[PDB]
Amino acid sequence: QWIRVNIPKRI
Amino acid sequence: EEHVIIQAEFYLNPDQSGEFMFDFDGDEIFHVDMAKKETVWRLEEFGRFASFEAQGALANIAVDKANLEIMTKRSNYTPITNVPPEVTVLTNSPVELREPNVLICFIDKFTPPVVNVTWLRNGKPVTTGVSETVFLPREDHLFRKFHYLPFLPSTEDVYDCRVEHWGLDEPLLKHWEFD
Amino acid sequence: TRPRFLELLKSECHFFNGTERVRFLERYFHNQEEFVRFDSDVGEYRAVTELGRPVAESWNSQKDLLEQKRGQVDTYCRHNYGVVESFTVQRRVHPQVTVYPAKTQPLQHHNLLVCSVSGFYPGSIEVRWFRNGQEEKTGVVSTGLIHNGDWTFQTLVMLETVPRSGEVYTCQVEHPSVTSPLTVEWRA
Ligand SMILES: *[C@@H]1O[C@H](CO)[C@@H](O[C@@H]2O[C@H](CO)[C@@H](O)[C@H](O)[C@H]2NC(C)=O)[C@H](O)[C@H]1NC(C)=O
């Protein structure tokens, strides 16, 4: 049902 | 590889504008209107099938923005090199006089991702029923964009697609007319 | 105007044989330059240019991080794949095919034939040209696949021949939207 986001890392 | 899905986002200074979208085999699945914080589906249909929490995109942009500020410093503030776009105009299908069709303006291989696109018909700019797509990714890390102009074939009316890009020496016009 | 500074992020998922094999790529770019990335095939972060070397070193020391990104092929890639498959991987729209003569010159002269295939999806498509049944493999030029940016492709394939009365030219399109190949004939 839901498309998941890939959360990036903070430099 | 039979298929590829890409989650592509970006933040740009000093324009302070960002985008978040999904690509399936070169097509846009959806994108998030950063302003209204609303998931926008390329095809009105997809909406009924899948769902996307817009807030997710906002949080991500915040991350991109922060890395940009840092990377921008640790790189002696070197600017991006403007790369002028290649433009192409084509019809949705074979043109038949007085038979609804669509003009397609395909802007490709450009960066940064900023452009002013306008549809000209016999000089005068049209905006009735036009549509476009956010910026789409590329292997070379450049951008693609589509603009659509629904029209009515005729022997008179001529059409133009105007593209303003900081890489161009002046507005670029790709012409299209019936023979 | 003033100089622009750009930050690009790309989360890529590559699928082969269904989801039998999946590849996850998290790539970081600054002004059109990728500097650090995660490759599920490698397992950890890597630099693509010197600015990334320091970054990678930091991230790769956070076990919880690598651990999370290594599961991305599953929690992110294979998951999303299941959520969109029915309307992307399975999406199928039949090709609209039309034939017509191009250019223009009186009897006994130059002439071309056009086969316009449009509005189909996916893009994978095959087109051939026949003359009185025999397949033509000479005077054929194609525009190649052409995206329309609206989940539909279009292609134009031409054939240069000298039309003779009574002849029959056929355009054949094979595509995933049709069990049997489509054909459009033009008679000289
Ligand atoms: C897109 O169009 C806008 C509108 O004109 C451009 O922005 C203006 O650019 C002029 C320089 O010619 C400035 O003097 C104005 O102040 C700008 N408007 C404002 C206040 O934003 C912009 O440069 C164009 N961008 C592209 C892609 O060429």
Residue nearest to atom 16 of ligand 1 (CA): C1
Of B29, B60, B71, the CB nearest to A11: B71
Distance (angstroms) between ligand 1 centre and the Cα of B112 equals 15
Residues in chain C: 188
| C65 and C131 share one domain | no
The 3-state secondary structure of chain C, one letter per residue: CCCCEEEEEEEEEEEECCCCEEEEEEEEEECCEEEEEEECCCCCEEECCCCHHHHHHHHCCCHHHHHHHHHHHHHHHHHHHHHHHHHCCCCCECCEEEEEEECCCCCCCCCEEEEEEEEEECCCCEEEEEECCEEECCCEEECCCEECCCCCEEEEEEEECCCCCCCEEEEEEECCCCCCCEEEEEEC
Three-class secondary structure of residue B142 per DSSP: coil
| C35 and C49 share one domain | yes
| B73 and B93 share one domain | no
Q: Which of C36, C58, C91 is the last residue of a domain?
A: C91
Distance (angstroms) between ligand 1 centre and the Cα of B84 equals 17
**Residue numbers of the domain that contains B85:** 80-179
**Backbone φ, ψ for residue C39 (5° rounding):** -125, 115
| C51 and C105 share one domain | no
If we measure between CA atoms, which residue out of B107, B105, B89, B115 comes closest to residue B144?
Answer: B107
| B60 and B104 share one domain | no
Which residues are CB-contacts of C108 (< 8 A; sequence separation ≥ 6)? C162
Kindly state the helix (H) or strand (E) to which residue B36 belongs, with its residue range. none
Q: CA-CA distance, C23 to B85, in Å (whole number)?
A: 31
| C72 and C111 share one domain | no
| C83 and C109 share one domain | no
Q: CA-CA distance, C74 to C69, in Å (whole number)?
A: 10
| B7 and B43 share one domain | yes
Q: Which of C71, C91, C111 is the last residue of a domain?
A: C91
The answer to whether the CB atoms of C80 and A3 lie below 8 A apart is yes
| C98 and C176 share one domain | yes
The answer to whether the CB atoms of C79 and A4 lie below 8 A apart is yes
| B26 and B85 share one domain | no
| C109 and C149 share one domain | yes
Number of domains in chain C: 2
Sheet holding B116-121, edge to edge: B124-126, B116-121, B158-164, B172-177
Of B22, B52, B66, the CB nearest to A10: B66
Whichever domain contains B139, its CATH number is 2.60.40.10
Q: Residues with beta carbon inside 6 Å of ligand 1?
A: B 114-116, 164-166; C 1
| C84 and C151 share one domain | no
If we measure between CA atoms, which residue out of B161, B70, B165, B38 comes closest to residue B113?
Answer: B165
Distance of CA C179 to the CA centre of its chain: 21
Q: Which of B79, B108, B138 is the last residue of a domain?
A: B79
**Residue numbers of the domain that contains C148:** 92-188
Whichever domain contains B46, its CATH number is 3.10.320.10
Number of domains in chain B: 2
Chain A residues inside the 8 Å CB shell of B56: 5
Residue nearest to atom 17 of ligand 1 (CA): C1
Q: CA-CA distance, C155 to C129, in Å (whole number)?
A: 14
Resolution rounded to one decimal, in angstroms: 2.5
Q: For residues C5 and C31, is the Cβ–Cβ distance under 8 A?
A: yes
| B90 and B75 share one domain | no
The answer to whether the CB atoms of A6 and B7 lie below 8 A apart is yes
Residues 1-11 of A with CB under 8 A from B: 1-3, 5-11
| Peptide bond just before C54 cis, omega within 30 deg | no
Q: Which of B35, B57, B79 is the last residue of a domain?
A: B79
Distance (angstroms) between ligand 1 centre and the Cα of B113 equals 14
| C130 and C174 share one domain | yes
Q: For residues B131 and B154, is the Cβ–Cβ distance under 8 A?
A: no
Q: Solving technique for this entry? A: X-ray
Sheet holding C33-39, edge to edge: B38-41, B27-33, B17-24, B3-13, C5-16, C21-30, C33-39, C45-47
Whichever domain contains C116, its CATH number is 2.60.40.10
Whichever domain contains C11, its CATH number is 3.10.320.10
Three-class secondary structure of residue B139 per DSSP: coil
How many CA atoms does the CB half-sphere of C138 hold within 13 Å? 6
| B90 and B20 share one domain | no
Q: Which of C48, C65, C91 is the last residue of a domain?
A: C91
**Backbone φ, ψ for residue C187 (5° rounding):** -115, 125
Distance (angstroms) between ligand 1 centre and the Cα of B79 equals 19
Q: Which of B50, B79, B108 is the last residue of a domain?
A: B79
| B122 and B75 share one domain | no
How many CA atoms does the CB half-sphere of C185 hold within 13 Å? 8
| C115 and C134 share one domain | yes
| C3 and C78 share one domain | yes
| B31 and B113 share one domain | no
Which residues are CB-contacts of C20 (< 8 A; sequence separation ≥ 6)? none
Q: CA-CA distance, C114 to B82, in Å (whole number)?
A: 39
Kindly state the helix (H) or strand (E) to which residue B61 belongs, with its residue range. helix B55-73
**Backbone φ, ψ for residue B161 (5° rounding):** -120, 120
Size of interface A-B (CB pairs under 8 A): 33
Q: CA-CA distance, C158 to C174, in Å (whole number)?
A: 17
Pick left, alpha or beta for residue B72 (phi over 0 → left; psi -120 to 50 → alpha; otherwise beta). alpha
> In this structure, what token pair is assigned to residue C139?
């005077």
| C78 and C103 share one domain | no
